[PDB]
Amino acid sequence: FYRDEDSGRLVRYSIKNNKIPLRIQEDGGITPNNDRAAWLLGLMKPADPAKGITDCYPLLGELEEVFDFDKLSKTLHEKISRCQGRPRSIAMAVDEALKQYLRELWEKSPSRQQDLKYYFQAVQEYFKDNFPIRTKRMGARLRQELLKDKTSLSRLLEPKHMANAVRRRLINQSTQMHILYGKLYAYCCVNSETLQRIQVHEAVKKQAMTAVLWSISRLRYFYQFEDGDILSNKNPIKDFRDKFLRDTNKYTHEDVEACKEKLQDFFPLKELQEKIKEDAKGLQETDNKQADTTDFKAIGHIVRDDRKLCNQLLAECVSCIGELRHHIFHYKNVTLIQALKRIADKVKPEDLSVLRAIYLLDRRNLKKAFAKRISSMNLPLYYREDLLSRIFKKEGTAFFLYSAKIQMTPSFQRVYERGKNLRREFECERMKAEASNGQNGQDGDRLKWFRQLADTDVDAQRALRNLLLLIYRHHFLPEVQKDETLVTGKIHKVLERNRQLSEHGYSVIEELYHEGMPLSDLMKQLQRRISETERESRELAQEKTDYAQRFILDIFAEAFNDFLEAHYGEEYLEIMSPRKDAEAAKKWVKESKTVDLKTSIDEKEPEGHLLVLYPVLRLLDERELGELQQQMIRYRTSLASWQGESNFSEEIRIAGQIEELTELVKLTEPEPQFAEEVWGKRAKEAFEDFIEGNMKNYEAFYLQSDNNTPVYRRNMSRLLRSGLMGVYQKVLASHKQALKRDYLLWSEKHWNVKDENGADISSAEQAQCLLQRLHRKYAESPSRFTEEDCKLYEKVLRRLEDYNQAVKNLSFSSLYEICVLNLEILSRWVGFVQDWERDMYFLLLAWVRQGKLDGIKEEDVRDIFSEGNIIRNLVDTLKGENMNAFESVYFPENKGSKYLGVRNDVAHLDLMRKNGWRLEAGKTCSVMEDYINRLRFLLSYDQKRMNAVTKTLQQIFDRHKVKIRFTVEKGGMLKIEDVTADKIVHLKGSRLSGIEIPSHGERFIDTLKALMVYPRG
RNA sequence: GGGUCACAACUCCCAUGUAGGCGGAGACUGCAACCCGAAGGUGUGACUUCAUGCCA
């Protein structure tokens, strides 16, 4: 589908007349392309409240006077009085009576038919939305079901309700058209390739601004500043910033220790100090060597002082964040990339000395960061060296930190499950073929490397999976990037296999790939097909079959298997024989193995834009980095997808550099230095009121115990880094997570399951082995299962689930999951606030352009959104009839003044502080409910944003396998009904009703419910 | 006090109030699928729909 200012092209007349409502007259002006756009743009006329005029849309009032709306309701009531129930009959009767009344009203008034056409279109849209006949979609089904009730039927026919609904619809369409006008002339002064490009650029800028706001909140956390504005140039705040941690009459050693300890969670300060100390020591022993340590020697006096280093690092950070906040939303630079280039041109890297030293120290640490990751996952305690050396050799390897992945590249997990299932199916069919024919076929190894072992524990398969994941991520994908023919070297074969089961589902996929086509185009069409399939499944409320995703998984699994055969064939037997040994685990880390990851980032001189953007990436935890990386991947694919006359090569290269830098920051962990044995002098306090008794009573684990990875430690470090512990100790105080029932259940070693096969289960490993054995026996024989084993399965399942929930509550995994969910609820509202800010900027620009505001210039508009508060600038700038004109676009008459303050509450991230979790006198609701309702009030200029508030909250909750229900109470307020947890359905078709297990425990659900309604609600 | 009734989106367009099409299109406007991915448990292979059978 392609449309332009002329027509539209690939019912038929709807395709042809689908063109843009706006056009450029080649002189900088935008003019309407039809009558409806001109009518929508001229509806808003500002009104003087002192003179007596109240509304800003007089034509809508006159049209609501002409359209009676009172005899229509009586006519419809009289018409449907002879229908009883049967909501479809009511729908046809209402539709017929409505079209009769509309044609009579059109015949009655011939003078004002022109605007009557658009009024009739709005009325017909209302009646089609609320009285549906067809029920193919789900929403139409529930509207028809709601048509059964007589009370809702009476409510839907009120004259005031219908008039207000038509007015709201028309005002919403007018506002959207003004915003579309204002989007142009801010980027332009062909539709398909330009509007999508503007959408992509705005998405990238908004994601960057969310990252900037997160780093601003982190900087305010560092400086311990109460309200105000840290990124300021006026005298008192600047003098406070320049004097921070100076002297001793104002600040104490505890202050500098707390500041440097907060800074250590994001920055490698201790390693930098040790590096400078060893660099100073080495200069006194060599008298003739041209080493690259001149830059490090200049800043030796700063980094040797804690106060000076902290103050200087905070100063350079504040300079970078302030320059980023000044730009990006500037009117000059179209792209964030050229904004970074202009910042790097303005501010030289000679000023940023501590920042560039931190960048260099982090760049020259990948060599041991990769070794730390390899040791951390599973690898050394299941392989007896001299094979990891054959894979991760210390000489130059084909391993890289980050590959510029192509769109819709599958993850390792889906590929692994698909290949493992295909291998199991092949094994079963070969065994069944050996039963029918007693001849041993010499073939049978065509899909190995996905074998499920037969040491055969669950940890051994974990280690094998992790090794294959490392090879897939750092070796196979750069090889595919350099030479894609590997994947193509399999594609035809997979299609043939599908045909071998026809005597199909890949018929749609058989037509796209002819002979030789760039896989990039293939994944773009498969992305389109997957998108339509998912959207249709979501719309029609049915679960369908995804053939394109399965095809992608199949071809990538075949390519991975053949690649592993080509390079690691001599070590297949040694890879498939893991063996647990703690001696190699205690070794391999005292040797400082320092493996040989490679990257394209320079080792002696950082680039200017990368150095400017480095603290922003350094101040994001784990998920905002992923969102920024996905936005950069989408931007790169979008730039590559456009045709000629583009000139976007340098932007593509810089975007790839940003992706690689983000991957480097993600890989190079900040070295949490927990040390000690259990506690230190930070988390201990931040974690007293979550342990039911004392931590010494839980000494069996939390220290030594299994002598393995201590997740509890990574969980507590990542929990304490996020800075939400003060909020959680104010809100979730009486919701202790360690408990004593869970520790008693974990210390239980005398399970009462009474296993049938001449033994008794005493450990969770034996229970997991019984689950695996019983599930394999069920998998081979689904239709024939003994009644004893079917209840034995549930008997071990419930005990294992109780044990796992006790472990998850004890290991602080539930609290960390709640923190991840809470930080996901935030930064969605920040995205909503960014959307509102951009929309209001473009709306005000469009209003000023078409002479709507009298004594207001474009300079004032840009100065509203340049510096200072946006809200205060709007209040001090627009007044009289202009403020009434601005307020005319928010329909919900229940609100009054003091609104738009939720923008300042969200953008400053007040919910990340203890003082923000307080409510006004009254309001009878919870903090989250209050924020939801104020967000609906703020976003009421756009209907889709107002519905997307609750929609996105429900989707975020459902991503964690948790439900949440809302009910609308009196006055239109939303309130939380319940939360609960969904259930995973175990063995199906087992001559039994099916075992049902909740996906989350009661402690997790109760804590999430306590967070959602803090005061009441 | 339907006055913010979301979940069950929103926008645009199909010739003469006629005429439909209660029909189409939309990374063009937002949620999604895909990835982040740790977290993780729900047997598989193969095809139709307003979620249940159909064959080894």
From TrEMBL:
<keyword id="KW-0051">Antiviral defense</keyword>
<protein>
    <recommendedName>
        <fullName>CRISPR-associated endoribonuclease Cas13a</fullName>
    </recommendedName>
</protein>
<keyword id="KW-0175">Coiled coil</keyword>
<keyword id="KW-0694">RNA-binding</keyword>
<feature type="coiled-coil region">
    <location>
        <begin position="523"/>
        <end position="550"/>
    </location>
</feature>
<keyword id="KW-0378">Hydrolase</keyword>
<dbReference type="GO" id="GO:0051607">
    <property type="term" value="P:defense response to virus"/>
</dbReference>
<dbReference type="InterPro" id="IPR053395">
    <property type="entry name" value="Cas13a_endoribonuclease"/>
</dbReference>
<dbReference type="GO" id="GO:0003723">
    <property type="term" value="F:RNA binding"/>
</dbReference>
<keyword id="KW-0677">Repeat</keyword>
<dbReference type="GO" id="GO:0016787">
    <property type="term" value="F:hydrolase activity"/>
</dbReference>
<dbReference type="GO" id="GO:0004519">
    <property type="term" value="F:endonuclease activity"/>
</dbReference>
<comment type="similarity">
    <text>Belongs to the CRISPR-associated endoribonuclease Cas13a family.</text>
</comment>
<keyword id="KW-0255">Endonuclease</keyword>
<keyword id="KW-0540">Nuclease</keyword>
